Symmetry: C3
Subunit: 232 residues, 3 copies
């Protein structure tokens, strides 16, 4: 299942249009390259519209949102949707920051294939993980989307079924962008064949499995190269 997703990512080499935050660009691109996918960060509004039609999948991560970037993200989402390409939302700090929250609420109309966030963010988007489970189900139902609430245990739901994924290591939280990079791999996984819910759960399992390996060294510095090595 994780093994299957791994083989699939390599065989399809999904081309992922990443519109993500300033802190995680490099790490996201290297995670995607390590699993055999192709990252591409295109942020000018016109280029983004052009490219989102071409890419296999689109990721929207609002971690360092600005108004200019929001314009280009909205154009990207519209062109992806028009072209039948699945897009993934990562609502970083929604619920904590007003503008972000308003923007993501507006993007929900545009029918993401998947939403990947923490409990607080999922709870905010819907209006501890366990507490977010009802909200995630409701979101998945309203939008016919797959919702992943990530944490020490990840929970993935299509609004009917719910899958839990345990493993990994707390050290992953002391490394920036592991969640942001998980969303990119989830975004890629949505362009792959199979049950979407199950592919998103496998993506969570893939990242946890790499993380458990990488965490063995014991430190967050050495974690990064080992994490990337484990993905490849």
């Amino acid at each position: 299942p994780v093994a299957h997703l791994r083989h699939l990512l390599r065989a399809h080499s999904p081309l992922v249009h990443c519109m993500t935050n300033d802190v995680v660009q490099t790490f996201t691109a290297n995670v995607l390259l390590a699993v055999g996918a192709s990252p591409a960060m295109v942020i000018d509004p016109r280029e983004a519209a052009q490219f989102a039609a071409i890419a296999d999948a689109l990721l929207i991560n609002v971690g360092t949102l600005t108004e200019d970037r929001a314009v280009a993200m909205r154009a990207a989402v519209e062109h992806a949707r028009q072209a039948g390409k699945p897009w993934t939302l990562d609502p970083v700090a929604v619920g904590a920051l007003t503008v972000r929250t308003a923007f993501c609420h507006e993007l929900l109309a545009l029918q993401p294939a998947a939403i990947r966030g923490n409990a607080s963010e999922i709870l905010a988007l819907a209006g501890t993980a366990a507490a977010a489970l009802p909200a995630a189900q409701a979101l998945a139902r309203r939008l016919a989307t797959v919702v992943a609430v990530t944490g020490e245990v990840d929970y993935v739901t299509d609004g009917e079924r719910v899958l839990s994924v345990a493993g990994g290591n707390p050290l992953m939280t002391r490394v920036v962008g592991t969640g942001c990079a998980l969303s990119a791999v989830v975004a890629a996984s949505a362009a792959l064949p199979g049950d979407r819910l199950e592919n998103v759960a496998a993506a969570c399992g893939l990242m946890k499995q790499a993380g458990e390996i990488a965490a063995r060294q014991g430190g967050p510095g050495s974690f990064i190269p080992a994490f990337l090595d484990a993905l490849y």
Copy 2:
């Protein structure tokens, strides 16, 4: 006192609003996470004004300054000040590039809790090697009621009168981008912690040099980085 600062960073886990440059974002966030703090990069002018009142501390680093970002940074600083949250200035290349030099002069009016810079930067800001910039650092510290850290082979930290110096580190630290910029973020975090601000800032300097001495044992700047982050992390 380095051991004490490490303990404090872990126990207080300060939330640090980082408005820093494009070259050192990731490293800054990983450094803060490694010492037990929580980074947050928020750059829209509205969100930044919102967030700067919530975070425990604010870092302003002008290394890749742009017009939009300057507006956002000023707003963040104004709201941090109004909320009582300490903000730190890192005046990267102030004195060499005009726009950011003027901008930083403006910002000094809003009373940073700390300023962390190299000798030339501190001289340009004061209106006057690290030790050569020491009378300027002291003048700047007195004028603003701030702590000034003039950094280099040896770091000097002053509140206007008291001068603490911090030796250690390794020249390899200068062949890795962002070690100085990451120091500013740890200094920023430390200004939010209990205790004497001067001693905490000197302690932040000691912490980063000790980690750097350890990481430099790996021989090269590539291996330096993982080792440096490992050395900052406990357990």
Copy 3:
């Protein structure tokens, strides 16, 4: 191989100050590579600051990997002030041919006389305006070099470098280099540095390609893309 070893010492000796206007994905790595080789990176992006600094720096890099309109303005100001001050500037036309805005922008920049251009086969073909790994674009390269009096480097598993008449080839490296982001973008930076060194420009740009291939070959035996990065920077630093 000799000019590569030579370049390695010249970069360290001159410590060229490179003004880097490059993409959001490769900032850190570009800076660290330039530091590892003994150069000095500087990322300056405000229009007024970039104009000021482009006059001062030893060389300028323009990489359009994550182009925006605001940034293209600053990049133009930089290029113009670098040219006025006689500092060599280098073009990395990332994804030219695949995205229209940056293709038009880079065509606009060609008029401003870059000292070097470095791209892959498809980018160089599209930049030259020719249809139909790197060998295939060598005609386009040559053509482009002549028209502009530039040095063009077309990279791939084998790199070709030309001033329009002469052609130098460099092989080696390792395909793992492609599973790590920014290795091309970083090569561009070192090329940009190399254009500011004394000697034959063409030969120096080729040697830059060689330097990076050699380090990549050593870095690649740490058989994963994660371990590659520290090993690559260490390799560039060693000696």
